[PDB]
Amino acid sequence: DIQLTQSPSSLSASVGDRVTITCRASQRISSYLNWYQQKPGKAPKLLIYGAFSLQSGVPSRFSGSGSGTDFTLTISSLQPEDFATYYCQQSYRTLTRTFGQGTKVEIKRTVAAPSVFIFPPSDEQLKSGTASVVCLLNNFYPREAKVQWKVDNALQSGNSQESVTEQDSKDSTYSLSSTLTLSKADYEKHKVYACEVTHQGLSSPVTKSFN
Amino acid sequence: DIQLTQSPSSLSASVGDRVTITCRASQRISSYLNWYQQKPGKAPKLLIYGAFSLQSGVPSRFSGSGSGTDFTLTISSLQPEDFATYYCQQSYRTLTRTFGQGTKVEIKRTVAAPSVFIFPPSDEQLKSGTASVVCLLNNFYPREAKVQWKVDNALQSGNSQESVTEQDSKDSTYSLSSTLTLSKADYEKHKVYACEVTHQGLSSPVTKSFN
Amino acid sequence: EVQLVESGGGLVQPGRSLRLSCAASGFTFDDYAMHWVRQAPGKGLEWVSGISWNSGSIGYADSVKGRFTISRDNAKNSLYLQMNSLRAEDTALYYCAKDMGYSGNDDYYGMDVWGQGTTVTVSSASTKGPSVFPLAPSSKSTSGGTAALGCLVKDYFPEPVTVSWNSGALTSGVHTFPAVLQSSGLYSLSSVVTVPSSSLGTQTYICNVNHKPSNTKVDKRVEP
Amino acid sequence: EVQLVESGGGLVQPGRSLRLSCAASGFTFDDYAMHWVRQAPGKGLEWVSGISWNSGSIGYADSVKGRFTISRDNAKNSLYLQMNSLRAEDTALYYCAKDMGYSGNDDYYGMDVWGQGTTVTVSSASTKGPSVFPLAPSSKSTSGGTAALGCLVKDYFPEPVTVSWNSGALTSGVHTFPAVLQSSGLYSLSSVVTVPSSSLGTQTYICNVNHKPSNTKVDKRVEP
Numbered sequence: 001d002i003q004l005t006q007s008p009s010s011l012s013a014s015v016g017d018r019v020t021i022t023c024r025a026s027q028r029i030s031s032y033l034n035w036y037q038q039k040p041g042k043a044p045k046l047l048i049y050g051a052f053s054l055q056s057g058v059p060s061r062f063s064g065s066g067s068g069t070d071f072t073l074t075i076s077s078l079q080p081e082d083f084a085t086y087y088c089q090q091s092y093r094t095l096t097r098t099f100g101q102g103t104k105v106e107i108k109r110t111v112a113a114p115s116v117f118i119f120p121p122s123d124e125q126l127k128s129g130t131a132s133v134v135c136l137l138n139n140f141y142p143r144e145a146k147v148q149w150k151v152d153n154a155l156q157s158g159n160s161q162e163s164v165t166e167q168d169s170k171d172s173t174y175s176l177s178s179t180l181t182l183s184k185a186d187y188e189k190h191k192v193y194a195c196e197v198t199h200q201g202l203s204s205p206v207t208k209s210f211n
Numbered sequence: 212d213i214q215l216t217q218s219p220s221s222l223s224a225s226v227g228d229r230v231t232i233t234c235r236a237s238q239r240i241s242s243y244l245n246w247y248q249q250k251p252g253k254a255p256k257l258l259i260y261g262a263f264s265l266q267s268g269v270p271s272r273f274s275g276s277g278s279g280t281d282f283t284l285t286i287s288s289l290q291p292e293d294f295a296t297y298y299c300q301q302s303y304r305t306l307t308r309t310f311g312q313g314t315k316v317e318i319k320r321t322v323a324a325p326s327v328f329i330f331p332p333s334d335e336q337l338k339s340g341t342a343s344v345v346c347l348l349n350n351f352y353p354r355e356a357k358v359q360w361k362v363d364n365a366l367q368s369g370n371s372q373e374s375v376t377e378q379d380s381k382d383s384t385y386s387l388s389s390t391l392t393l394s395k396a397d398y399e400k401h402k403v404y405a406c407e408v409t410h411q412g413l414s415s416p417v418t419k420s421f422n
Numbered sequence: 423e424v425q426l427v428e429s430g431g432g433l434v435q436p437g438r439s440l441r442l443s444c445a446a447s448g449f450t451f452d453d454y455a456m457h458w459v460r461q462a463p464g465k466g467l468e469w470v471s472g473i474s475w476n477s478g479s480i481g482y483a484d485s486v487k488g489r490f491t492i493s494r495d496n497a498k499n500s501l502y503l504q505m506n507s508l509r510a511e512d513t514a515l516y517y518c519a520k521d522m523g524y525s526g527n528d529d530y531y532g533m534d535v536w537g538q539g540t541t542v543t544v545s546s547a548s549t550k551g552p553s554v555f556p557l558a559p560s561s562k563s564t565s566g567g568t569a570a571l572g573c574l575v576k577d578y579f580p581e582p583v584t585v586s587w588n589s590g591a592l593t594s595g596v597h598t599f600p601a602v603l604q605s606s607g608l609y610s611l612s613s614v615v616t617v618p619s620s621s622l623g624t625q626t627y628i629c630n631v632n633h634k635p636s637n638t639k640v641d642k643r644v645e646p
Numbered sequence: 647e648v649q650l651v652e653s654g655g656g657l658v659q660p661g662r663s664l665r666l667s668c669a670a671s672g673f674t675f676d677d678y679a680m681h682w683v684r685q686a687p688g689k690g691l692e693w694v695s696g697i698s699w700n701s702g703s704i705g706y707a708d709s710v711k712g713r714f715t716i717s718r719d720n721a722k723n724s725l726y727l728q729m730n731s732l733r734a735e736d737t738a739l740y741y742c743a744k745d746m747g748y749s750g751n752d753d754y755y756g757m758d759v760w761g762q763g764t765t766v767t768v769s770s771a772s773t774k775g776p777s778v779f780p781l782a783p784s785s786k787s788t789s790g791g792t793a794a795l796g797c798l799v800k801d802y803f804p805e806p807v808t809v810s811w812n813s814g815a816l817t818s819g820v821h822t823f824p825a826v827l828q829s830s831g832l833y834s835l836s837s838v839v840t841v842p843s844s845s846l847g848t849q850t851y852i853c854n855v856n857h858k859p860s861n862t863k864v865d866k867r868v869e870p
C-alpha cells in the first residue's frame with residue numbers, strides 16, 4: 001500500500017503571485033503523475049497528464065515539473081480563477097488508481113481579529129428538553145481560530161461542534177460557528193456560561209458570557 | 212413511504228364562521244385529494260373526490276380549493292352539524308391508499324379556569340396493596356389543560372395517566388381526570404401529597420394538598 | 423338501500439388468527455373494488471388491505487404484509503379478510519369499504535361506502551370483571567366549592583363497562599371518563615359527580631358498575 | 647457535446663443494496679475504460695472500481711472488494727455499478743468518469759471526462775423534518791458592537807435544507823453555515839445575520855427554513 005502525500009494543507013497567495021504545489025509517493029509507483037483541479041460544487045477536471053503533457057483547453061499558466069522522486073505543479077502567475085483544490089494521481093499501471101489528500105489555495109489578506117457574539121438558549125429549546133449555546137466569530141482572516149467552552153468557570157469538551165464557512169467572495173474573510181450542547185437536566189445545574197476566543201489577530205483572548 | 216401532513220391539531224370556530232383545513236404530502240403522490248368526514252361512534256364518509264368534485268348528498272357548504280401542492284377544504288359557513296374530524300387521503304395510483312391523521316373542528320368558547328378537586332386513595336385500595344389519587348378539572352373550555360403531580364414537595368412523572376371527556380354538548384366544556392398510581396408501601400412512606408394545575412383560564416397556578 | 427355489513431371480531435390473545443367478513447347489499451358487489459381500513463382509539467384512519475375487481479391486483483399494508491390475506495366471493499356477494507399471527511398493535515376497529523371504481527389504479531376517486539366496523543382486541547388476558555374503589559369527597563376543604571365525589575373502576579379486561587350513579591337515578595353533574603389501559607393489560611376508569619355540599623349528609627351516593635361479560639355488578643357507597 | 651450522465655442514488659437503509667448507472671454521450675463508449683470515483687463531504691477523491699474496455703479486466707478498491715460489482719453494456723452506451731451491503735461509511739457523492747485510454751494498464755493517462763456525481767446516503771433514519779429555535783441578540787451587552795441575531799435548524803435528516811431571511815429580502819450580513827451531522831444521525835445547522843443594533847426595535851426579523859424534501863416550511867421570528 002503506497003500512499004501519495006501532498007503539501008500539509010493550503011497555500012496563501014495574491015493574484016499575480018507564483019504558486020508551487022508538490023506531491024510525492026512513499027515508494028515509486030510510476031514515471032508519471034497526473035494533476036486534477038476541483039472547484040466547490042463541481043466535478044474534478046484533468047489539468048496535466050503524463051507528468052509533462054498539458055491537457056487541451058488548459059491555459060499555459062499551468063506547467064508540470066519535478067525533482068528527485070517528487071512531482072511538482074507550478075502556476076506561473078496566479079489568476080482569480082485559479083483558486084481551487086488540486087489533487088495528484090498515480091495508477092500503478094493498473095485499474096486501482098489512487099489520489100493524494102488534496103491541497104487548497106486561499107486568497108492572501110492581512111490578519112484581522114473576529115467579532116465575537118454569544119447566543120443563550122431559547123425558551124422554545126428549553127421546552128424541548130434540550131439547551132445549546134452558540135459562539136460566533138465573524139469576519140476574521142486566519143483560518144486557524146480556536147474556541148473553547150466553559151461552564152461555571154470550568155472547561156468542557158466532547159459536547160460541542162464546529163462549522164466553518166468558505167472564504168468570502170468580497171471580503172475574503174471567514175466565519176466560524178461553535179455550538180455547545182447540553183441536556184436540560186444538566187443545563188439547569190449551571191448558572192454561568194461562557195466561550196473563550198483565541199486568535200492571531202487578538203492581543204488577548206476574548207470572553208463572552210451570560211447568566 | 213410518503214406521509215401526509217395535516218393541520219397541527221384542531222380548529223376552534225363558532226357557528227357561522229369560516230373554517231379552512233389544509234393538507235400537503237411530503238412528496239408528490241397524486242393530482243387529486245379525497246376528503247372524508249367522521250363523527251364519534253360513526254364510520255367516515257366521503258365529501259369531496261377528484262379535488263373539486265363534490266359527492267352527491269353533500270351540501271354546497273363544503274368546497275374544494277388549493278394552492279401549489281397544498282390542498283384545502285373550505286367550509287363557507289360553519290354549521291352545528293359540521294363539527295367533526297376531517298381526513299385527507301391519496302391513492303398513489305395503487306390499492307395501498309394513504310390516510311392522514313385528520314383535523315378536528317372544536318366549538319369556540321370563552322376561556323375560563325377549571326374547578327379543582329383532589330381524591331386521595333381509598334382504604335380498600337391500601338388493603339389491596341395499592342393506592343391511587345386523582346386530580347379532577349371540571350367545566351373548562353380549552354382542551355390543553357396541564358396537571359402535575361408532586362409528592363413530598365418533589366415533582367413526579369411517568370407514574371400517572373390522563374383521561375379527558377369529549378366536549379360537552381350544552382356547555383361546550385371539558386373534564387379532565389389525572390390518576391397517580393402508588394404502591395401501598397410507597398404511598399405510606401410519604402408524608403404529604405400535592406397536585407398542581409396549570410390552565411389558560413388561570414391568572415396563577417393552583418396547588419392542592421393532603422396528608 | 424346501499425350498505426355494507428361487517429361480521430366477526432372479539433377479544434383474542436396474541437399468536438392467534440381472526441377472520442373478518444363483510445356482506446354487500448343494495449348494490450352490485452363485483453362492480454367495485456373492495457378495501458379494509460382500521461382505526462385504533464385516539465388514532466386516525468389506517469388502510470390495511472384491498473383488492474381489485476376480478477382479483478386483478480391485491481395489495482397489503484407493510485405492517486401486515488406477511489400476515490394478512492384478502493379474498494372475495496362474488497357468488498355470495500361477500501368480502502373476507504384473514505388476519506394471522508395477531509399482535510397487540512393490531513387492536514383497532516375494523517371497517518369494510520366500497521371503492522367508487524373497480525381498480526386501485528384510478529386516482530380520481532375515493533371510497534364510496536363505509537360499513538359499521540367491529541372491534542378486534544389482541545391481549546393475553548381473560549374477561550376479568552371490574553372492582554370498585556370509592557373516592558370520598560374532600561368535604562373538609564371543598565364545602566364552599568361544591569362537593570365532588572367519585573369512584574374508581576379497576577382491573578377489568580373487556581371494554582364495555584357501564585358506570586352510573588344511584589342506579590341511573592343520578593345523571594346530572596356526572597362526568598364519566600374514558601377507560602385507560604394499564605400495563606397489566608387491564609383497564610382502569612374513573613367517574614366523578616358534582617353535588618351541593620349540603621347534600622352530603624342527607625343523600626346517599628352509590629357507584630354502580632355493570633359488566634355483562636363477567637356477570638358482575640358492583641355497588642359501593644361514596645361518602646365523606 | 648461530450649458528457650457523462652449519472653443516474654440513481656437516494657436514501658437507503660444499512661445492509662440494503664443500491665444500483666447506479668451512467669449514460670455516455672458525444673463520444674464512442676466502447677473505445678475507453680471506465681471508472682467510478684466517490685467523494686465524501688470534507689474528503690478528497692477516492693477510487694472505488696473500474697473496468698477495462700471489452701471487460702478484459704476488472705478491479706475494485708479493498709474497502710468494497712467483496713461488496714461492489716462493476717459491469718458495462720457496450721451496445722447500450724452505459725456503465726453500471728451494483729452496490730450490495732451498503733453501510734453508513736459508504737455515504738458519498740458518486741462520480742462517473744471516463745479513462746483517456748482503452749487499457750487499464752497504461753500509466754500515461756488520467757481521467758479527462760467527469761460527470762455530475764449523484765448522492766448516496768446510508769442511514770438508519772427517516773426523513774424527519776426540522777425543528778426551529780430562535781437565537782435572540784444580546785442587545786443588552788452588544789449594543790455598541792453591532793447586533794447579531796440568528797436561528798437554529800435542528801433534528802432534520804435530509805441534507806439539502808435552505809435558509810434565507812425575510813423571504814430573501816435580507817441577504818446582506820447573512821452568514822449561513824454547513825450542517826454538522828449529529829450522533830443521532832440527524833443534521834443541525836446555524837444561520838446568523840449581523841445588523842445595526844438600533845434597527846432591532848424597528849425591523850422585524852424572520853428566518854425562513856425551506857425543507858424541500860418534505861415540503862415543510864417554517865417561518866421563525868427572532869426578537870431580543
